[PDB]
Amino acid sequence: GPLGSVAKKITWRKQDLDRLKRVIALKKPSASDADWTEVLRLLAKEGVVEPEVVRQIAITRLKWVEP
**The one-letter amino acid at 21:** K
The reply to whether CATH 3.60.15.10 applies to domain 1-67 is no
Of the chain, the end-to-end C-alpha distance in Å amounts to 38
Determination technique for this entry: NMR
Which residues partner with 9 through β-bridges? 7
Angle between helices 51-61 and 33-43 (to 10 degrees): 80
What percent of the residues of the chain are helix, what percent strand, and what percent coil, each to the nearest 5?
60, 5, 40
The answer for residues whose C-beta is within 8 angstroms of residue 23's C-beta and 6 or more apart is 39, 42, 43
